[PDB]
Structure 1
C-alpha cells in the first residue's frame, strides 16, 4: 500500500538490493547439483558449478542472515534454463554457472531449482518484505560456431523444450550472422556477436514475441524487477518497445540495464539511454569514482562530489540510478592487505546516497579477488558480527523511514581532499553524512551548516565507525566538532509532511491506459486529482490513493515530455516530476532503411516524423545519427525505432551537421505500422 511496501514493484529508491551470484551463495539442495565435469567439488575451478541454488537463498532468508542486514531486494542470476554442456576455452573447462548462456527462457536452470523452488523463493522473499530482481539476458543464447555445429550447444534456442532453432542452419533468421564485434562502435557491438555468443535478431518477429512471452512468464510468477544484461549491445528502439510492452501489461516493474563505463568516462549514448529508453541504468560513473576515491585513492572527495553533481545534471531520473561499489565483473572492493574501513565508508556513502543502492554478495564479509572468475568465489561466511554487516543493518532501513534518503536532493556541506560532508533533503526531512577517509588524521569541523532543526543528534551508526554526536543551533548552524580519523557519521531528522510532495514517479514512460505509480509524502487519504501537464485525471482515472502512494491511469494526452503533478482533495498542488515521457500508444519496433543517401564527411542521416516518437518534425528531436555499416552499407542508412503500433506514420529523412539541415525531396513517406509485430520499411532518398 505505501511507497515503502514490498508490493511497490515499480519504484526502488527506498530499497537496498543484494546482488547474488546464485551458484556461489549457498547450496541448499545438493540434489540439483550438476554431476561430472560440470561440477567442482573442491572449488579449484571457478568456471564450474559450485552448487548454489534458490533453496540456499531461501534458507538465508529464513535463518535471518539476509533479513538482519536490512536488505529489501535480491538481485539474482538469470533463472532461465542454460546449456548443460562443458566448453573448454584455452584448455580450461567452463560451464554456465553464471546463468548467461541461455537455452530456454521459459524453463528453469535445474541447478538453481525448479519452478516450485522459484515460486517458493518469490513467496519467502515477499513474506519477508523482500523484492526479487532477476537478471535477464535477451541479447544472446550461448557460445556457438556456424561452421562447427559440434561446438557447445550451437547456441540452440528452445521454446519450452520445443526447438526454435540453432546457430548453424538458421533458416528463420533467428540470429545475426555478421561475425564477431571489435567493440569499435556502438553499431558494431549491437548487430554482431559478443565473442562467440549467438546474437539474437530482435528484428525477427518470432524473437520479439518469444521474449515478450518469456518475460511475461517470469513477471507472472511475481518477479519485481529486471536487470537487463548488455543493454549496450541491443538496439535502443527494440528495448524501448520491449519495456513499453512490460509497462502496458499486468506487471509494470522496475527495469535497469548494464551499460559499462570505464574510470573517468562519460558517454552521451549512455546518458541518452538512461533518459529516453524507458529503462534505467546501473550507475557506473558513481561506482568507478567511489572506487577511485576510497579503494585506489586516485581521486579525492572533491572529485567525488563533482561526479555527484555532474551525474545529477546529466540524468533525468537520478533516483533510479542503481549504485554500487563493485560487481561480478569488477575486482573485489576489498584489496588483500588493506583496511576494512574503506569498504565500510564506501558502503555508508552508497547506502545514504541518491538512487538504488546495490551490494554485491560477500562485500560485508570483505571477500577479495581480482578478475572475472576470482571475484565470484563461494560465500566465505555468514558472520553477522562484522562491522560492514552492522553498517548495512544500521543504514539500510533509513531508505524506508527517511524520505530525504530515498527521494532527497544532494548538497555539498563540506569538502576536503579527505573529508566529505553531504546533506540529503526532502521537505522537512533531512540527513547529514560525514566521512573522513584519512586513516591517520582527524579533522576539526567548524562552521558547518545544515537543514536540521535545533537540538542534539546522535550518530545513527552509534560510533560504529568512530562517529560522534553533534549539536545544532538556530539557522542550522552545527557547533564545532572533530571528525575522527577513518570517521563516518550519520545524523538525521524525519518529519511528517503536511503538503503534497512527490519523490518519484514510475515508470518514467508510458502510453495512455498505463498505470503509473507516484510515491512521496502528504498526498492525503482521499482521492484528489493527478495532473499530466495541465491535463487532469479525475477519480475514475485514480486506481488508488493514499498518503505516500498514488496509482493512476495515464490520460489521453499529447505524446512527449510532460510534467506530472498532484493535487489533494483540498485542492493543494504538489511539486512537479520532470520529464515523464508520454507515448503515442502501444509500441512496435520498426526498422527504417533508406538508400542512396549520400553525405560528405561530418554529415549524418536522421529520421523525423509526425509522431512524438519520431520527433514531431523537429530536426532537433530527430532520430539518429542512423547506422550505415552492418545491417546495411553506406549509402544505405538504417535504424531500429520504437514507434506507435497500428499507426499511419508520415516521415522524412534529413541530413544534419553544422547544422546545414537538408530535407528529403518532395512528398513525405507514408507507412502503416504493424499492430503487434516488428516491421521493416525501405525507401529511397
Structure 2
C-alpha cells in the first residue's frame, strides 16, 4: 500500500538492489546441475556452470543473509531456457551459465530451476518484502555461424518447445543476415550481430508478438522489474513501443537497461535513451566517477560533485538512475591487497545518493577479479560480520524511512580534494553525508551549514567508518568538528509532512488509460485531485489514494511532455513531477524509409510529423540522424519509430546540416498505422 511496499513494482528509489549472477551465488539444488564438459566441479573454468540456482537464492533469503543486509530487491540472471551446448571459444569451453544465450523465452533454464522453483523464489522474496528483477534479452538468441549450421545450436528459437526457426535456413525471416557488428556506429551495432549472436528481427511482427507474449508470462508470475540486455543494439523505437505495451498492460513494472560508458565519458544518445525511451538506465557516469574517486584516486571530490551536478542537468528522471560501483561488466571494485575503506565509502555514498542503488554480489565480501570472467567468481563467503555488510545493513533501510534519501534534491555543503559533504532534502526531511577519502589525514570542518533542524545528531553508522556526532545550531550552523581520516558519517532528520510532496511518478511514459504510481509524502488519507498539466483527474480517475502513494489513470490529455501534480482534499497544492511523457495511444513500431534523399557531407535526413511521437513538427525534435547503411543504402534512409496504432500520420523528411534546415517540398506524406502490428512505410523524397 505505501510507497515503500514490496507491492510497488513501478518505482524503486526506496529500494536497494542486490545483483546476483545466479550460477555464481549459491548451489541450493545439486540435482539440477549440468554435467560433463558443461560443469566445473573444481571451479577452474569460470566459463562453465558452477551450479548456482534459484533454490540457493531462496536459501540465502530464508537464512537471513540477504534480508539481514537490508537489501529489498534482487536482480538476477535471465531466467529463460538457454542453449545447453558447449562452445570452444578461444581454446576454452564456454557455456550459457550467464543466461544470455536464450533458446526459449517461455521456458526456464533448468540449471536454475523449474517454473515451480521460480514461483517459489518470487513468493519467498515477496514474503520477505524483497522485489525481483530479471534480465531479459530480446536482442538475440545464441551463437550462430553463417557458414556452419552445426556451430553451437545455430541460434535456434523455440516457442514453448516448438521450433520457430534457426539462423541458417531462416525461412520465417526471424533474424537479421548482415554479419557481425564492428561497433563502429550505433546503426551498425543495432542491425548487425552482437558478436556471433543470432540477431532478432523485430520488424518481423512474429517476433514483436512473441516477445510481448514472453514477457507477459514472466510478469504474470509476479516479476517486479525488467533489466533489458543490450539496449544499445536494438532500435530505440522498438523498445519504446515494447515498454509502452507493458505499461498499458496488467503489470506495469520498473525497467532499465545497460548502456555502457567508459570513464570520463558522456553520450548524447545514452541521455536521449534514458529521457525518452520510457526505459531507465544504469548510471555509468556515476559509477565510473565514483571508481575514479575512491578506487583509483584519479579524480577529486570536486570532480565528483561536478559529475553529480551534470547528471542532474542531463537526465530528466534523476530518481530512476540505477547507481553502482561495479557490476558484471567491470573490474571488481576491490583491488587485491588493497584496503577495504574505499569499498565501504563508495557503498555509503551510493546508498545515500539519488537514484536506485544496486550492489553487485560479493561486494560486501570484498571479492576481487579483473575482467570477464574473473569478475564473476563464485560467492566467496556468507560472513555477515564484514564492515561492508554492516554499512549496507545500517544505511539501506534509510531509503525506506527517510524520503530525503529516497527522493530528495542533492546539494553540496562542503568540498575539498579529499572531502565531500552532501545534503539531501525532501519536504521537511534531510540527510547530511560527510566523506573523507584520505586514509592518512583528518580534516577540520569549520563553518559548515545545514538544513537540519537544531539539535544533536548521532552518526547513523555509529562511528563504524570513523564518523562522529554533530551539533546543529538554530540557524543551521554545524559546530566545528574534525572529520577523521577515512571518515564517513550520515546525519538525518525525518519529519511528518503536512504539505503534499511528490517524490516520483512511474512509469515516466504512458498513453491515456494507463495506471501511474505517484509516490511521496503528505498526500493525506482522503482522495484529492491529480493533475496532468492543468487537466484534472478526479473520482473514477483515482484508482487509490493514501498519504504516500496515489494511483491514477492517465486522462485524455494532449500528447507530449507535461507536469504531474496533486492537490489534497483540503486543496493544498504540491510540487511537480516534470517531463512525464503522455503518448497519443497504444503504440506500434513503424519502419520509415525515404528514397532518393541525397545530401552533402555533414548533412543528414530526419523524420518529422504532426504526432507527438514524431516530434510535432519541431525540427529540433526531428527523429534522426536516420540510418542509411544496413537495412537500406544511401541515398535511401530509414529508422524504426514508436508511433500510435490505428492512426493517420502526417509527416515530412528534412535535411539538417550546419545550422540550416531544408524541408521536403509538396504535400505531407500520409500513412495510417496498423492497429496492432509493426509495419513498414516507404516513400520517395519530394523535391
* TM-score interval (norm. to shorter): over 0.9
Deviations 1:83-118 (A, max 9, x none): 000000121000000000000000000000000000
Measure the CA separation in 2 of the matches of 1:194 and 1:620.
31
SS at match of 1:226: strand
Q: CA deviation at 1:329?
A: 1.1
SS at match of 1:210: helix
Deviations 1:259-296 (A, max 9, x none): 00000000000000000000000000000000100001
Q: CA deviation at 1:207?
A: 0.4
SS at match of 1:661: strand
Measure the CA separation in 2 of the matches of 1:138 and 1:521.
37
Q: CA deviation at 1:554?
A: 0.1
Aligned length: 685
SS at match of 1:475: coil
**Superposed counterparts of 1:549-564, under 5 Å:** 549-564=549-564
SS at match of 2:621: coil
Root-mean-square deviation over aligned CA pairs: 0.5
Deviations 1:14-47 (A, max 9, x none): 0000000000000000000001111000000000
Unaligned residue ranges in structure 2 (runs of 5+): none
Q: Structure 2-normalised TM-score?
A: 0.99
Measure the CA separation in 1 of the matches of 2:345 and 2:123.
34
Measure the CA separation in 1 of the matches of 2:354 and 2:610.
37
Deviations 1:453-497 (A, max 9, x none): 001000000010010000000211000000000010000000011
Measure the CA separation in 2 of the matches of 1:35 and 1:618.
59
Measure the CA separation in 2 of the matches of 1:444 and 1:620.
50
SS at match of 1:474: coil
Deviations 1:212-267 (A, max 9, x none): 11001000100000001110110000000000000000000000000000000000
Deviations 1:289-328 (A, max 9, x none): 0010000111111101100000001000000000000001
Measure the CA separation in 2 of the matches of 1:484 and 1:666.
72
Measure the CA separation in 2 of the matches of 1:332 and 1:625.
37
Q: CA deviation at 1:658?
A: 2.9
**Superposed counterparts of 1:100-499, under 5 Å:** 100-499=100-499
Q: CA deviation at 1:615?
A: 1.1
| Higher mean C-alpha displacement, 180-189 vs 12-21 | 180-189
Q: CA deviation at 1:665?
A: 1.9
Measure the CA separation in 2 of the matches of 1:332 and 1:651.
49
Deviations 1:180-217 (A, max 9, x none): 11111111101001110111110010001000110010
Q: CA deviation at 1:661?
A: 1.5
Measure the CA separation in 2 of the matches of 1:106 and 1:129.
26
Measure the CA separation in 1 of the matches of 2:660 and 2:351.
48
Measure the CA separation in 2 of the matches of 1:640 and 1:602.
22
SS at match of 1:198: strand
SS at match of 1:620: helix
Q: CA deviation at 1:390?
A: 0.2
SS at match of 1:351: helix
Deviations 1:338-390 (A, max 9, x none): 00000000000000000000000000000000011111111000000000000
Deviations 1:143-200 (A, max 9, x none): 1012200000000000011100000001221011111111111111010011101111
Measure the CA separation in 1 of the matches of 2:348 and 2:162.
48
Q: CA deviation at 1:435?
A: 0.5
SS at match of 2:8: coil
Measure the CA separation in 1 of the matches of 2:172 and 2:225.
31
Measure the CA separation in 1 of the matches of 2:239 and 2:133.
18
Measure the CA separation in 2 of the matches of 1:616 and 1:343.
47
Measure the CA separation in 2 of the matches of 1:372 and 1:471.
47
Measure the CA separation in 1 of the matches of 2:90 and 2:438.
44
Deviations 1:548-588 (A, max 9, x none): 00000000000000000001111111001000000000000
1:96 is matched with: 96
SS at match of 2:475: helix
Q: Structure 1-normalised TM-score?
A: 1.00
Deviations 1:579-620 (A, max 9, x none): 000000000000000000011111111111110001111212
Q: CA deviation at 1:667?
A: 1.2
Measure the CA separation in 1 of the matches of 2:627 and 2:670.
21
SS at match of 1:85: coil
SS at match of 1:496: coil
Measure the CA separation in 2 of the matches of 1:465 and 1:575.
36
Q: CA deviation at 1:659?
A: 2.6
Q: CA deviation at 1:670?
A: 1.0
